[PDB]
RNA sequence: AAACUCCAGUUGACACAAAAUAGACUACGAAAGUGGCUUUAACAUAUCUGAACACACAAUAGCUAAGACCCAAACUGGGAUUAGAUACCCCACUAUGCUUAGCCCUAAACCUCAACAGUUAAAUCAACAAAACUGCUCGCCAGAACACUACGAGCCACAGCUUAAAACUCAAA
């Protein structure tokens, strides 16, 4: 939380998309009923912070995996 | 300083016989218990005892026992207001110790994890 | 209830609202203003703004009132209080020079006086310990030894040992007997305070 | 009053039922000598800690 | 000077008096606070036997005796037998986790005695006799 | 028996407060352990039993002190949200 | 309620019984087991493994004999509860528990996890419990029940222990 604002803004200074909020699960394996059958996932996702608050991996990691998204990590 | 835990369990190295025989798996939960139910302190009982004591001795006539009755009256009305101070202040006054309720939303935030990831 | 939760409750004392503005503290003079944004409900028919209005009378009329009768009620508590008024100046004419100044011919002091001597000041309550009822000795709240104090009175009166005498006569009789400390509305009062003085051997259980 | 002697190892019971006879002792015990005893050195308290590894580290 | 927990030891001499009385001269009050009676015996310091009182002496019976009214009010009736001996001030030595262990000494302050002293006295084995086994209630 | 009376488990009366004597009086016999232990020699507890309330005992001190010490490491975190709104 | 009433309380004298705290220690010993004090003797083995029976041990209960006796206490007796109560609750008392000398040889004798040596990598592992394995050896086990039985043999054991089947039966346990 403490780098959210920051990173936030670097996405949009840079054209970029970003995610510092709770991960509703289903982001990314269930892309199609939350956001649309023609959504476009993305193609990078790149982890500034790889664990969640209570010190475990983020859910990202395993569901970028499993979506074939190759991941950049801190 | 917690007690050890060194060849207390039965175990493959501990050669010895165990220590201790738990029930229950010593491993910390992510919450504590609930607070009990106090019983109590029964209040205006010695100026309830001096009052019926004055009444045998006058045939239980108010007439000559009304000091005594003043007494048992004025701190039943002390002790009224006080059983209500304490109900609310207590749960909403912050002194000492949190509530269970509280420090089970600071022990979830930082939970033991007995297993690896 | 067809009044909503907003509606606060109307405050008939007219001494009340002519206080000056000088008197008001800081915290009344808040609340003043803050009934003005209020609703407040309909004053009931029962009280006014008299200045003969008692509220300790008004209540036993309705302890006595059957099926909303309660012109026959208020017929009844009047009768009462000329009765207690004609006895008291019967036994003035007739006292002695030194005897007229300890006569109370109010009838509203020997009311009030009466009912309050007739108050219980600890009551029987049921605790629940180990699994058992046990009446130990409780202190009674202000209303509850006023409310049995009017019961106590209403049910001697209706109690059929009288076999034809009306209640106010009855009612005036027992009234003058509270007043001077006897009859059997005060042994009532004692026969419950000597229950409450052989059980206390249970005045722990409770706790408050 | 201690005395401080050196004496065989069949002599303490010989001389315990010896005083258990005299009327001017109230009561004696002999007991080797604290002197006869090296205290090893210590290099102070060792801490130890808290056991490891044992429950498995499964999701119960 | 400071105020000490612990009793006067008789050989060293101390300036703690009660009515001109060393700490040894004052009289004791025994309490057995038993779990279905409480005896109570006021003797003095050469072990002479003033006043002795209990809850069947006041007239209780079978489960009125193991309270603490019943403590009380033979406390009381032992601090009025030996108050008439001049009685005043006393050691007391409770011996028992019963219910009228406390109840006994209130009612000794309701007859006109005052409490010097709190002595336990409560009969601990360093094992030597079996209880009773255990029960099924 | 043999020992001198009125040394052990005495306590004096400060201005006639005997409540506060009694009090801590008793609060020196449960330090102690006295008062659980006459509690438990009033029925015999047999060895099986008593080599049972003792691992209970001692399993609880641990979990107790443990969730203790975790508590008091944890409460400087209990201050307000330092990043409210992210 | 019964029981006792030479009863209870204080003080004092006074054990062939049992060993608060320490012990939040985690030790000794083959195990069983061992926690008051002192003293004496004293705790196998310079490869490992190795027995229902050889050899020597083995909680409690129990037998035989002679002693002791505070308390506890199967049986029994009394009191109460209950539809009944050969039980649970109360009281009392005995065998027994102690010592000595012999016997008996059992246990949920279970840390239900053999001894020795070794590893933490790989396929981590049905589940649970106390993570998963390797090497070597002895011992044991092959549906349930019949069966801690029957017979035989052996044993200071004579209502006993050890070893230990089958037939009928089921399609599950
Ligand atoms: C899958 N079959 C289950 C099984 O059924 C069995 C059941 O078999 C029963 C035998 O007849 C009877 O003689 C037998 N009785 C005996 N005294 N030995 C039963 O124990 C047996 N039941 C059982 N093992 N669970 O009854 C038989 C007729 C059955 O249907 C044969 O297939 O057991 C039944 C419960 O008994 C279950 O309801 C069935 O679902
Ligand atoms: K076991
Ligand atoms: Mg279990
Ligand atoms: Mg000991
Ligand atoms: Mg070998
Ligand atoms: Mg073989
Ligand atoms: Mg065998
Ligand atoms: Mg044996
Ligand atoms: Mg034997
Ligand atoms: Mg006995
Ligand atoms: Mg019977
Ligand atoms: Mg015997
Ligand atoms: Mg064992
Ligand atoms: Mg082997
Ligand atoms: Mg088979
Ligand atoms: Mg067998
Ligand atoms: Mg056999
Ligand atoms: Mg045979």
């Known amino acids: 939380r403490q780098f959210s604002y920051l990173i936030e803004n670097m996405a949009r200074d840079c054209g970029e998309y970003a995610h510092t909020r709770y991960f509703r699960g289903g982001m990314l394996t269930n892309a199609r009923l939350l956001f649309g059958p023609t959504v476009r996932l993305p193609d990078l996702i790149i982890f500034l912070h790889t664990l969640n608050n209570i010190f475990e991996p983020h859910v990202a990691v395993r569901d970028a995996a499993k979506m074939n998204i190759p991941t950049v990590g801190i | 300083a917690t007690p050890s835990l060194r060849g207390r369990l039965a175990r493959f190295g501990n050669p010895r016989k165990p220590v201790l025989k738990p029930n229950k798996p010593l491993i910390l939960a992510n919450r504590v218990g609930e607070r009990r139910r106090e019983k109590g302190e029964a209040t205006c009982i010695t100026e309830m005892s001096v009052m019926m004591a004055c009444w045998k001795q006058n045939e239980f006539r108010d007439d000559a026992c009304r000091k005594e009755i003043q007494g048992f009256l004025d701190c039943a009305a002390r002790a009224q207001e006080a059983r209500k101070m304490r109900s609310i202040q207590e749960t909403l006054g912050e002194s000492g110790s949190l509530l269970p309720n509280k420090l089970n939303k600071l022990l979830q935030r930082f939970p033991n994890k007995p297993y690896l990831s | 209830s067809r009044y909503?939760?907003?509606?606060?409750?109307?405050?008939?004392?007219?001494?009340?609202?002519?206080?000056?503005?000088?008197?008001?503290?800081?915290?009344?003079?808040?609340?003043?203003?803050?009934?003005?944004?209020?609703?407040?409900?309909?004053?009931?028919?029962?009280?006014?703004?008299?200045?003969?209005?008692?509220?300790?009378?008004?209540?036993?009329?309705?302890?006595?009132?059957?099926?909303?009768?309660k012109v026959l009620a208020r017929s009844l508590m009047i009768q009462t209080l000329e009765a207690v008024?004609?006895?008291?100046?019967?036994?003035?004419?007739?006292?002695?020079?030194?005897?007229?100044?300890?006569?109370?011919?109010?009838?509203?002091?020997?009311?009030?006086?009466?009912?309050?001597?007739?108050?219980?000041?600890?009551?029987?309550?049921?605790?629940?310990?180990?699994?058992?009822?046990?009446?130990?000795?409780?202190?009674?709240?202000?209303?509850?030894?006023?409310?049995?104090?009017?019961?106590?009175?209403?049910?001697?009166?209706?109690?059929?040992?009288?076999?034809?005498?009306?209640?106010?006569?009855?009612?005036?009789?027992?009234?003058?007997?509270?007043?001077?400390?006897?009859?059997?509305?005060?042994?009532?009062?004692?026969?419950?305070?000597?229950?409450?003085?052989?059980?206390?051997?249970?005045?722990?259980?409770?706790?408050? | 009053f201690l005395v401080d002697f050196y004496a065989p190892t069949a002599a303490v019971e010989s001389m315990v039922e010896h005083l258990s006879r005299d009327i001017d002792v109230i009561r004696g015990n002999i007991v080797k000598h604290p002197l006869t005893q090296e205290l090893k050195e210590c290099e102070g308290i060792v801490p130890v800690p808290l056991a490891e590894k044992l429950y498995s580290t499964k999701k119960r | 000077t400071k105020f000490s927990i612990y009793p006067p030891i008789p050989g060293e001499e101390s300036s703690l008096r009660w009515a001109g009385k060393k700490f040894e001269e004052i009289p004791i009050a025994h309490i057995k606070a038993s779990h279905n009676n409480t005896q109570i015996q006021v003797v003095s310091a050469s072990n002479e036997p003033l006043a002795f009182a209990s809850c069947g002496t006041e007239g209780f019976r079978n489960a009125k005796k193991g309270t603490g009214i019943a403590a009380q009010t033979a406390g009381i009736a032992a601090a009025a037998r030996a108050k008439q001996k001049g009685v005043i001030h006393i050691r007391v030595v409770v011996k028992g986790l019963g219910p009228g262990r406390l109840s006994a000494m209130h009612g000794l302050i309701m007859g006109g005695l005052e409490v010097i002293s709190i002595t336990d006295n409560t009969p601990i084995p360093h094992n030597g006799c079996r209880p009773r086994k255990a029960r099924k209630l | 028996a043999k020992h001198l009376k009125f040394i052990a488990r005495t306590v004096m009366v400060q201005e006639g407060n005997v409540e506060s004597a009694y009090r801590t009086l008793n609060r020196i016999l449960t330090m102690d352990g006295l008062i659980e232990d006459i509690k438990h020699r009033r029925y015999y507890e047999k060895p099986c039993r008593r080599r049972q309330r003792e691992s209970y005992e001692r399993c609880r001190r641990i979990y107790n002190m443990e969730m203790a010490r975790k508590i008091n490491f944890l409460m400087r975190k209990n201050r307000a949200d330092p990043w409210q709104g992210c």
């Open chain 3, 85 to 208: 008024k004609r006895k008291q100046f019967e036994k003035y004419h007739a006292a002695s020079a030194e005897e007229q100044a300890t006569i109370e011919r109010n009838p509203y002091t020997i009311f009030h006086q009466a009912l309050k001597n007739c108050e219980p000041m600890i009551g029987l309550v049921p605790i629940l310990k180990g699994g058992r009822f046990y009446q130990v000795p409780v202190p009674l709240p202000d209303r509850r030894r006023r409310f049995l104090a009017m019961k106590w009175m209403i049910t001697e009166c209706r109690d059929k040992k009288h076999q034809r005498t009306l209640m106010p006569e009855k009612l005036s009789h027992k009234l003058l007997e509270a007043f001077h400390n006897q009859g059997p509305v005060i042994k009532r009062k004692h026969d419950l305070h000597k229950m409450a003085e052989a059980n206390r051997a249970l005045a722990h259980y409770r706790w408050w």
């Open chain 3, 4 to 69: 909503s939760p907003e509606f606060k409750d109307p405050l008939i004392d007219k001494e009340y609202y002519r206080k000056p503005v000088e008197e008001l503290t800081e915290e009344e003079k808040y609340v003043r203003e803050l009934k003005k944004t209020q609703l407040i409900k309909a004053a009931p028919a029962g009280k006014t703004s008299s200045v003969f209005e008692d509220p300790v009378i008004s209540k036993f009329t309705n302890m006595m009132m059957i099926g909303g009768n």
